Design a protein around this ligand. Sequence first.
Ligand SMILES: CC(=O)N[C@@H]1[C@@H](O)[C@H](O)[C@@H](CO)O[C@@H]1O
Ligand SMILES: [Cl-]
Ligand SMILES: [Cl-]
Ligand SMILES: [Cl-]
Ligand SMILES: [Cl-]
Ligand SMILES: [Mg+2]
Ligand SMILES: [Mg+2]
Length: 342
Amino acid sequence: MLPALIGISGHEVGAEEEAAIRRLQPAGFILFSRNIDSVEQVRGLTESLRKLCLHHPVIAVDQEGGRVVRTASLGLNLPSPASLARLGSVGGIVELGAVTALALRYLGVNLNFAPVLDICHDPSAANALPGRCWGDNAQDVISRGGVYASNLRRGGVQSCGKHFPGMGRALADPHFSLPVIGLDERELFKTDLLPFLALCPALSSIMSAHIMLPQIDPDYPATLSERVIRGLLRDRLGFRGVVFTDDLCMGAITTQYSPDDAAFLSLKAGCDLPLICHDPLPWLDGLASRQESLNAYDRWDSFKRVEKLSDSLCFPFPEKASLWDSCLRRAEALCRLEEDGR
Ligand SMILES: CC(=O)N[C@@H]1[C@@H](O)[C@H](O)[C@@H](CO)O[C@@H]1O
Ligand SMILES: [Cl-]
Ligand SMILES: [Cl-]
Ligand SMILES: [Cl-]
Ligand SMILES: [Cl-]
Ligand SMILES: [Mg+2]
Ligand SMILES: [Mg+2]
C-alpha cells in the first residue's frame, strides 16, 4: 500500500491512473469538483476506486459548506460554518453534519476533510476563502465544531480536524517562505491547539498545515517536522489517529520541495498519509521507492493507524432514489434556514 492519498483527473479513472493504482495500491483518494457531475457517475467512480484496491480505500472530499463545496453539479449546496455560527441555530449545525454524512455516504465517500478547527481570531485577518471557521475563540469552535463532527461521524463518515496546529494564528513573515506561528507552545495549548485536544474522540484524523513553528523547529514546517509531529502532535497533544498533510502539489510548499520528497519527509516526520492532490502520477514511483528507507517500526505504527481508519470506513448506501431526494431536500432546507435567519 502506497501511504498517500492521490487525486483523480476526471469523471472516471483514466488509463494511466488505473495502471498506477493497480501497481502501487494507494491508501486512498481525494475527490474535487472535477470528479463530481451526477449521482450515478460519482457512485460509479467510487465503486471503481474500491474495486481497484485490495484494501478498503479512503475516499475523501472537502465538503465544508459555503465556498468549499464539491457537489454544485449535483445541485447539493450547503451553508458555510460561519453562517451557521452567526445564525446561532444548534439544530442547523447538527443538520449540516447529518446531511453531509448522508449525502457523502450515498456517493460512496467515506471521509470528509472537516471540521475546520481554525480560530478566526480577528475580523481583520483577511481570508481568501471566507466563512470556513466555526467561531472567533477556541471554546465556540470546540462547541460548534464538536456538534458538527459528532453528527458527521454519527452518520458513518469519518472526520478530519484541520489545520493543525491552528491556522488562525499563522502570519506572513518576511524572513520565511511559509506562514509562521511565533506563539509559545503554552499559549497555543490555551488557544489554537485547544480544539484539537478537546475534540480528539470526535476526530477520526487530523490534517497538518505547511506552517512554521520556529520555537519548536526553525528548519522544517509542521508537516515535515519530526519535532512538531512526533513531539507536539503525538506526544504532548496525544493524538493517536491518522495524520494527513496539506496538499503537496499547490501552494508555497512547492517552491521548497517537490511532491515526492515532501511526501517522504512527512512520513519521516510521523505523518501517515500525505496528500498528492493534483497530477499525482509523476511523483508516486519516487515515493514508493524511498519507502523502505524508513524506520521499519515507525512504518509499522503508521500502518496500524491507517489500517484502523480503513476498518472504520463505511460503504455506500444501496441505490435508492428517494434517499438521494431527501439529501437534496434537506440541503435545500438548510440553505433556506440560514438565508431566512439573516
Ligand atoms: C489551508 C487549506 O485550505 N488547506 C487545504 C485543505 O483545507 C484541503 O482539505 C486540502 C485538500 O483539498 O487541500 C489543502 O491542503
Ligand atoms: Cl489517466
Ligand atoms: Cl460566510
Ligand atoms: Cl481562543
Ligand atoms: Cl486520539
Ligand atoms: Mg449534474
Ligand atoms: Mg476495496
